[PDB]
Amino acid sequence: AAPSQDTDSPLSAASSSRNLEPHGKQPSLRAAKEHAMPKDLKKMLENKVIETLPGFQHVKLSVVKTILLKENFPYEGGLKIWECTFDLLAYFTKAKVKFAGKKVLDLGCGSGLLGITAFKGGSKEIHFQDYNSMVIDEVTLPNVVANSTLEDRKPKVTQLYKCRFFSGEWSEFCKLVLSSEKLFVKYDLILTSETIYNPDYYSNLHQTFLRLLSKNGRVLLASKAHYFGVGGGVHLFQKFVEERDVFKTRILKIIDEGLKRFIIEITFKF
Amino acid sequence: AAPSQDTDSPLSAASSSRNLEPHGKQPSLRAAKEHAMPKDLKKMLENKVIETLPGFQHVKLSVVKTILLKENFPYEGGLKIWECTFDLLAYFTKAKVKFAGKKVLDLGCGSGLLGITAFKGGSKEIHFQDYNSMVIDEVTLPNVVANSTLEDRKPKVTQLYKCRFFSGEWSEFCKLVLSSEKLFVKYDLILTSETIYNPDYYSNLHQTFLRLLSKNGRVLLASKAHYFGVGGGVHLFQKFVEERDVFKTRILKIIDEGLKRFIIEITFKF
Ligand SMILES: C[S@@+](CC[C@H](N)C(=O)[O-])C[C@H]1O[C@@H](n2cnc3c(N)ncnc32)[C@H](O)[C@@H]1O
Numbered sequence: 116a117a118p119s120q121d122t123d124s125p126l127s128a129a130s131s132s133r134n135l136e137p138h139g140k141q142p143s144l145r146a147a148k149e150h151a152m153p154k155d156l157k158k159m160l161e162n163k164v165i166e167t168l169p170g171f172q173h174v175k176l177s178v179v180k181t182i183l184l185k186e187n188f189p190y191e192g193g194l195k196i197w198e199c200t201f202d203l204l205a206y207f208t209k210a211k212v213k214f215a216g217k218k219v220l221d222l223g224c225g226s227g228l229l230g231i232t233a234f235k236g237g238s239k240e241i242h243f244q245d246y247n248s249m250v251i252d253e254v255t256l257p258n259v260v261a262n263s264t265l266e267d268r269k270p271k272v273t274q275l276y277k278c279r280f281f282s283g284e285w286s287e288f289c290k291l292v293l294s295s296e297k298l299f300v301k302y303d304l305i306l307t308s309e310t311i312y313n314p315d316y317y318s319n320l321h322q323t324f325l326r327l328l329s330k331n332g333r334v335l336l337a338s339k340a341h342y343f344g345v346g347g348g349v350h351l352f353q354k355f356v357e358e359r360d361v362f363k364t365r366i367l368k369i370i371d372e373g374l375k376r377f378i379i380e381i382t383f384k385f
Numbered sequence: 386a387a388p389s390q391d392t393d394s395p396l397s398a399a400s401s402s403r404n405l406e407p408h409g410k411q412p413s414l415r416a417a418k419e420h421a422m423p424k425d426l427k428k429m430l431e432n433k434v435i436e437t438l439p440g441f442q443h444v445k446l447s448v449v450k451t452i453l454l455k456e457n458f459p460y461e462g463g464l465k466i467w468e469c470t471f472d473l474l475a476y477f478t479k480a481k482v483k484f485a486g487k488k489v490l491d492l493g494c495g496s497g498l499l500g501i502t503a504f505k506g507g508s509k510e511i512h513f514q515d516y517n518s519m520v521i522d523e524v525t526l527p528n529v530v531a532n533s534t535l536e537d538r539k540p541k542v543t544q545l546y547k548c549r550f551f552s553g554e555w556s557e558f559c560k561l562v563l564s565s566e567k568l569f570v571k572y573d574l575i576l577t578s579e580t581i582y583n584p585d586y587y588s589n590l591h592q593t594f595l596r597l598l599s600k601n602g603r604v605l606l607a608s609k610a611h612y613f614g615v616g617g618g619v620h621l622f623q624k625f626v627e628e629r630d631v632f633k634t635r636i637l638k639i640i641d642e643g644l645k646r647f648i649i650e651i652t653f654k655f
């Protein structure tokens with residue numbers, strides 16, 4: 116079997132992440148879960164490798180890698196980070212996106228670099244959501260912790276309470292998170308990278324924006340133009356939003372290399 | 386045991402790469418080896434993940450990753466790439482370093498991104514050297530191949546003969562490579578990243594430059610200011626070069642973040 120290249124979707128056989136994404140004719144109808152921050156913070160990072168993310172078109176970010184032997188050869192392993200994440204990171208710095216004091220959601224966070232940027236940026240509350248439970252425990256939580264002062268700009272260890280972590284399908288996450296405060300406060304910003312690859316979940320995603328976004332807030336969404344096979348894309352999604360007539364969209368940036376990538380802004384009409 | 390951070394040297398216990406680097410009181414006195422390009426090119430990449438290197442302060446480069454399960458959770462694994470590699474990549478683009486027609490050596494190549502840049506840049510001959518045999522077979526060779534047109538700017542498959550691959554200690558590599566042509570042609574460029582961390586091998590490295598560098602060529606060396614424990618660094622190395630009085634050095638760029646990093650040019654006096 117051929118190697119996965121950039122142009123394989125999150126659901127292709129070749130993709131490392133296939134089994135961390137909802138798929139099939141009857142996926143989990145399990146409820147969503149909030150994940151607590153472990154008591155022992157140093158233990159989440161034991162034996163890991165903390166690596167600076169290279170490139171100067173973003174803030175200083177760290178990523179946690181795991182040493183994994185194969186035929187006694189040491190690999191540094193991490194969860195795949197999709198291209199559009201870096202586009203959105205670059206766009207935060209270039210467009211001087213303001214994070215201080217905001218309530219922020221990283222929807223479909225994977226490694227959590229978007230939320231972590233907001234965290235380091237002075238956001239009051241940062242929520243992270245991934246579909247997969249293990250992604251949150253094994254990757255997201257450790258990554259956030261590694262971007263605190265624990266070891267060692269970086270927020271002190273005592274600010275970690277500002278971050279909260281959720282797993283499950285968007286419908287479930289929505290119901291759960293709406294019940295998690297005496298009176299729910301909407302997000303000022305929802306940041307999301309590569310979450311419109313699958314048209315089967317556009318209904319759920321739209322409904323999530325409708326229930327969770329503040330009146331005056333916005334979604335910053337990064338996406339490839341099209342995803343082959345699974346069949347989602349930017350045009351298709353804008354059509355979907357346009358038909359429902361609740362939000363407006365606006366293309367903030369095109370990244371032009373080979374197949375195009377987009378950063379898109381979604382706000383309420385209004 | 387605490388996680389390895391940027392400020393651990395290549396020989397620290399925490400470092401993933403410790404056993405791929407020469408160390409101890411009696412390392413291998415084995416001869417160096419040239420490694421042939423395998424016959425079956427597609428098979429070198431089977432089941433791998435080909436990932437674009439993010440950041441736009443370098444040319445488009447691809448990196449081969451391996452899917453490695455742990456508790457049934459899929460990691461994308463790769464050999465560690467040291468920070469200074471990216472500094473030197475940025476410096477190639479910023480300073481418009483000219484590669485076309487040159488004979489180039491990537492000394493201590495690891496993943497081989499420096500040599501690959503030269504390859505994509507039109508160099509006539511590109512030699513890759515790592516200490517470790519497995520590094521070359523498992524990482525370097527596949528990385529070069531992944532940056533050819535095989536799958537599918539990128540050089541066609543038919544240009545791969547221009548790349549040659551070597552493993553072993555620098556003294557041995559030198560003797561070997563000097564015997565590998567009816568009349569050896571010196572390198573116009575030697576590119577090297579993080580190879581002066583260990584003062585025990587400064588003699589060997591200097592001798593390698595002396596025997597292998599063209600009269601009118603140059604070494605472009607990227608290094609951290611200092612490496613703790615093992616104890617090498619930029620000042621210490623410039624002293625060493627200065628004492629032997631064969632080469633001159635010149636600092637081309639400082640990258641100023643926390644502890645400093647340098648790009649250094651070495652030429653003959655003449
Ligand atoms: C391809 S990944 C991108 C991950 C990360 N944002 C990045 O760019 O590297 C897709 C993300 O969307 C999430 N996701 C996809 N469909 C979902 C759904 N129906 N409900 C909840 N989360 C979903 C996945 O868990 C994952 O975080």
Ligand SMILES: C[S@@+](CC[C@H](N)C(=O)[O-])C[C@H]1O[C@@H](n2cnc3c(N)ncnc32)[C@H](O)[C@@H]1O
Binds near residue numbers: 470496517555586
């Ligand atoms: C820390 S790594 C850097 C690898 C790669 N250049 C990078 O920046 O990611 C050190 C490199 O120097 C090589 N090396 C170190 N000492 C050596 C020696 N005495 N002889 C030959 N190679 C050596 C290693 O094999 C490796 O390629």
